[PDB]
Amino acid sequence: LPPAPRYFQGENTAGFMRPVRFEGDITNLEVVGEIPKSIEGTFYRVMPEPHLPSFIPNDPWFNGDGNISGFYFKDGHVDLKQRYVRTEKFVREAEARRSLLGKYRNRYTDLVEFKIRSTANTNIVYWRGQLLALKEDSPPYAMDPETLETFGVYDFDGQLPSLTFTAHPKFDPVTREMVCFGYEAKGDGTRDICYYSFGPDGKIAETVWLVSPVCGMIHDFAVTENFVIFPIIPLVCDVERMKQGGDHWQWDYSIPMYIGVLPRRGAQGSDVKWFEAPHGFAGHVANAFEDDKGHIQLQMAYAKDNVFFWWPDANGKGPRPGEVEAHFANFVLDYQSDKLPLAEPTYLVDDDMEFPRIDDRVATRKHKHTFFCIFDRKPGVTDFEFVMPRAGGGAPMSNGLAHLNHETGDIQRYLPGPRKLTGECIFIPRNSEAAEGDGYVMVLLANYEDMCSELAVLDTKDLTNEVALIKLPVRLRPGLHGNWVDKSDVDGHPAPL
Amino acid sequence: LPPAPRYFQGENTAGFMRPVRFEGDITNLEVVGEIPKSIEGTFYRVMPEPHLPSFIPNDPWFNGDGNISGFYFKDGHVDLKQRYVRTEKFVREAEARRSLLGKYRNRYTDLVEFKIRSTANTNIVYWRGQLLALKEDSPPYAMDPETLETFGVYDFDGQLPSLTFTAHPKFDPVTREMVCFGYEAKGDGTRDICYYSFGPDGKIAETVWLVSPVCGMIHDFAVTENFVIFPIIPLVCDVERMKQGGDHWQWDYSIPMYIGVLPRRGAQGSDVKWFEAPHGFAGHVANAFEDDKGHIQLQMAYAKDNVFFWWPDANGKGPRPGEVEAHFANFVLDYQSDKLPLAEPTYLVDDDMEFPRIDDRVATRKHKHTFFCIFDRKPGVTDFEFVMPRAGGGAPMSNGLAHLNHETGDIQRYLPGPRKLTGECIFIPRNSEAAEGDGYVMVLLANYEDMCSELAVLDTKDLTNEVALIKLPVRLRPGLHGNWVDKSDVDGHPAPL
């Protein structure tokens, strides 16, 4: 077999990116300042964190085993629980005590035959009393919210129609539906998209099979009252390339950024319209909604080149690390229009940004607050001379959060400091009567001075000030998505405004 | 109540001394070099590690909650399991989410009434299929060797005759007895010593009550074929001082270092002889044995002043940090002698040393190998300018190990490096046929450059060279005693030579 290294090597596992691989508990975390005593609930986040050194050199960050952190808050106290998702990969590799799964999304490079290849490492959401650990090439893994025990692969009581489940389902706050899809829904390289939804009782509602113009990556999507919207990243899959040991994904400079629009209820596959936005990278969706005219306002991060630069075009052409910026874009779509080309979007702010969150009490409806990561290259904001030698590689960098008020246009920026970087934030309603966007924001910080992680708690009345800073004595490796589950919400999701 | 701080403050919890407080698992530890594949068994060690910030300022290191590490070795792979002892203190403080126990060994400063005040933080030994987590003011806590679950306070099937159980029992490799004692055996300030032993079937054998000349600290003891030996540290307890909120222990410059000798079998309390060694500090016992003439050779660390300088005499007189050296001393005792004063000991080496280990296959008999920590102040051995600002305070420092061959007088020294310090080592017989002192040595390192811990594996054929270096991504706080439990030993203890 390819040799199994016994320690981690390469930039993607150096410095702050070095795997820790701890599972267990740290109760009664140290706190500087004061956690608001009324906060009650749990912040769950997931990080890729290889349990064993890969036999693939420079294995991408996205291919690491999913490790779940839960921060449990009550009466101004907080405990951490941490546990790996027991994926097929995790379990079989743990049994063998070596890596067996090969290249990202390429089963032809695996050392054994896997049924499920999930690392369950991208998102962790709450649904009907369980956590669902998500990875877009796979079904979810169900987990216990209290103990973080893995129950196993989840198929929604045998109803799951797709081989794949998006890392970005949307929760309709009015209908209490979970709205979902999967791409490559019938296997490697397929252009099949399965759009599907579940009512709050757990029964499947929608199931519509449609066909993508290309086999492209659909990482995120958007949902409005009457439509679902599928933006396609111009990364394209050719299974024949994969069979020869090549990459699942390859950039295509010759195609637009497709944006499919399908009626949300009662549609057939042929009802989808594939609009054509200017060539670019579809980043994360903040939210979409229908305005007065019934036009879709789609607000999302959008770049003009390949953010995933390690998967270049057929001739190896693409950007370098740190070159591509994404901007907060507004696209306008009209399902009734027969004109497929779309205009350039308008931009809501000028910041290099990503990882937008809204108050999910208005998800699928008009929102007027967005919170998001920023990367500000303004001199002094990050001490690069200090940070970069300690940082390792393979993950995006965020050196602040921003809050945009969409009515006033006001922006507040949280800067944790010159030797700290941030993950994706969560928003917590102050209480069940709170106005949209009024409450608390939490975000995990990487502190390169201490080589420790911290959890910051902010009040939305002044995002520039930490009300509390929770000081972890270990590193939590840079991670992906996370979610707040409030104790006052019976189904784990906040009530509509 | 006294306010409960929400983060750690003071030098005793700064830098490398900052509590981490993690419990759980890290499997498949990273390894540089190669762990000998024939090593099979578990290294258990205990560290004091406060679970909650104390309401006592500058609480001594010895007062921290005991946290058990197990390093499980098989076929050149190693896993870490880590868990706090569930003492009464740990559990009640965890329930309250704040410190309740007060000053070291002073119940008059506690915020609630405790039945058992153990932190179980000093030693962790194997006995009849359980671990025993030891603390000299208390009975043992029994734990599961595999899971590190705490069973509870252990009273040896109701046979335990003493309120106290030493952190330093001896295991007779010929008789398979565990030889024990407790001082302050009837409670605070009592001069009662209870000497007791258990056969390999778990039945109590010896039980002898004797009387100390003063209520002094008896941290360690020694066992030979026919005698047990009790060296008394000139720290003395006055309960009236304690009731006014003072220290349990106070140095007394006016007394000798008493060394009691009692016949090992069939004695009465009045059979003890209290010999009087020159005033000094009784450190850890390497081993004792009877020579040809029937004289006791007692080999132990010995200092000429108060190593525990934070407990000075009644007038505050005592040494400063880093001032007191302990030396490897040989005392000669003759139970038949009626002369109580003893001569100054001879010294086996020049090094400032402590934490001696022998090949326990010759415990209570003549040994000719000792392994021990050293602290070399010679310029360059430790980079103090780098280390001391990162070190915190409250714990002893060791910047190498030494192996003394008592026959040849040869010494090898292991120096981990200028920015690393060591804990207490363990010795592992190469196999069941190995000669005395032939095999492997393991020792936990504090790496002040990485602010991480490492576990070093050395071969006794060349102590200067690391065969393997196991790289932990977390800190294990400086700890106290630990033990090897070999898989080939059914009762957990090695076979006699």
Ligand SMILES: Oc1cc(O)cc(/C=C/c2ccc(O)c(O)c2)c1
């Ligand atoms: O900084 C960014 C920006 C972005 O727009 C998307 C991502 C992550 C996408 C992703 C895609 C596939 C995976 O398997 C996976 O773990 C993650 C990260």
Ligand SMILES: Oc1cc(O)cc(/C=C/c2ccc(O)c(O)c2)c1
């Ligand atoms: O560096 C040294 C040298 C020594 O000779 C003894 C000790 C530890 C003794 C001890 C005494 C009482 C306790 O409660 C405890 O946790 C530890 C540490």
Ligand SMILES: [Fe+2]
């Ligand atoms: Fe995402």
Ligand SMILES: [Fe+2]
């Ligand atoms: Fe000791």
